[PDB]
Design an enzyme around this catalytic site. Structure first.
Site, PDB file in Angstrom:
ATOM      1  N   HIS A  12      47.833  79.916  79.407  1.00 17.33           N
ATOM      2  CA  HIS A  12      47.458  80.390  80.725  1.00 17.33           C
ATOM      3  C   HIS A  12      48.485  80.772  81.706  1.00 17.33           C
ATOM      4  CE1 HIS A  12      43.614  79.296  79.733  1.00 17.33           C
ATOM      5  NE2 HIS A  12      43.915  78.014  79.602  1.00 17.33           N
ATOM      6  N   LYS A  41      41.361  83.263  70.016  1.00 12.41           N
ATOM      7  CA  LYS A  41      40.823  82.608  71.186  1.00 12.41           C
ATOM      8  C   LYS A  41      40.076  83.759  71.841  1.00 12.41           C
ATOM      9  CE  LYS A  41      42.619  79.811  75.091  1.00 12.41           C
ATOM     10  NZ  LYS A  41      41.579  79.207  75.913  1.00 12.41           N
ATOM     11  N   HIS A 119      43.703  72.783  81.989  1.00 10.58           N
ATOM     12  CA  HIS A 119      42.628  73.590  81.444  1.00 10.58           C
ATOM     13  C   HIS A 119      42.253  74.541  82.538  1.00 10.58           C
ATOM     14  CE1 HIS A 119      38.483  74.803  80.985  1.00 10.58           C
ATOM     15  NE2 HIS A 119      38.273  74.206  82.146  1.00 10.58           N
ATOM     16  N   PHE A 120      42.011  75.812  82.237  1.00 12.89           N
ATOM     17  CA  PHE A 120      41.680  76.897  83.190  1.00 12.89           C
ATOM     18  C   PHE A 120      40.194  77.247  83.097  1.00 12.89           C
ATOM     19  CE2 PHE A 120      42.703  80.564  85.747  1.00 12.89           C
ATOM     20  CZ  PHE A 120      41.655  81.428  85.400  1.00 12.89           C
ATOM     21  N   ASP A 121      39.442  76.970  84.145  1.00 15.75           N
ATOM     22  CA  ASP A 121      37.980  77.054  84.181  1.00 15.75           C
ATOM     23  C   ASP A 121      37.352  78.392  84.556  1.00 15.75           C
ATOM     24  OD1 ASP A 121      36.010  74.825  83.543  1.00 15.75           O
ATOM     25  OD2 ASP A 121      35.307  75.133  85.678  1.00 15.75           O
TER      26      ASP A 121
END
Length: 124
Positions: A12, A41, A119-121
DNA sequence: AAAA
């Protein structure tokens, strides 16, 4: 090893571009940021701010994760992000993405001590 | 777009 924090910057974080240089920004990146490892991904967003800024988001607007989990945080500001979707031409190992570039708030999940992104939401 |  591949730490959580560390896992966030690989997947990210691209502070090297103000934004997607081209439409391949996503096939070049994904690929390289080892996201295409042992799979494609399907979707990943690259943020184009510093790390110190992205990490800030953990001291920022706390919002829920789409997950429902509670340590997500939206950025007060707005970042340059390049969102990457695979195209319906993606076939592992042949991962191929659709670069979408935007300026949006980002929403990330924080964690640890130091409490940093892990973690990128979303993006909004 | 996050992991005994």
């Amino acid at each position: 090893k591949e730490t959580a924090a560390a896992k966030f910057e690989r997947q990210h974080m691209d502070s090297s571009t103000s934004a997607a240089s081209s439409s391949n920004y996503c096939n070049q990146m994904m690929k390289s940021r080892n996201l295409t490892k042992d799979r494609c991904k399907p979707v990943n967003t690259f943020v184009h701010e510093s790390l110190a800024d992205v990490q800030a988001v953990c001291s920022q607007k706390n919002v829920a994760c789409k997950n429902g989990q509670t340590n997500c945080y939206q950025s007060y500001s707005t970042m340059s992000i390049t969102d990457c979707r695979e195209t319906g031409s993606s076939k592992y190992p042949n991962c191929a993405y659709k670069t979408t570039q935007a300026n949006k708030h980002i929403i990330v999940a924080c964690e640890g001590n130091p409490y940093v992104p892990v973690h990128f939401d979303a993006s909004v």
